[PDB]
C-alpha cells in the first residue's frame, strides 16, 4: 500500500539523480 | 501517525513531480 | 515500521540534494 508509493518514488528520484549525472556529463 | 507518512509521502510526489517538471525544461531550454 | 520511517528520510534527503543541485544550475 504505503510501501508501493514508497517504491514508486524511489523510481523517479533514481531517474532524476541519474538524468542529472548525465546531464553533468553532456 | 499514518497520516503523517500518508502525508510526507504526498509532499514528496509532489517535490519529486516539480523537479521531473524542472527537469524537462531545462532539457528542453 | 522504522524500515517506512528510514525510507521516508532517506528519500527527503536525495529530493533536497536534487533539488539543491538544480538551482545551482539555473544560475548557469
Not at 3 to 8: K, P, T
Not at 15 to 23: H, R
Amino acid at each position: 500500500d504505503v510501501q508501493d508509493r514508497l517504491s514508486a518514488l524511489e523510481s523517479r528520484v533514481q531517474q532524476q539523480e541519474d538524468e542529472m549525472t548525465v546531464l553533468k556529463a553532456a
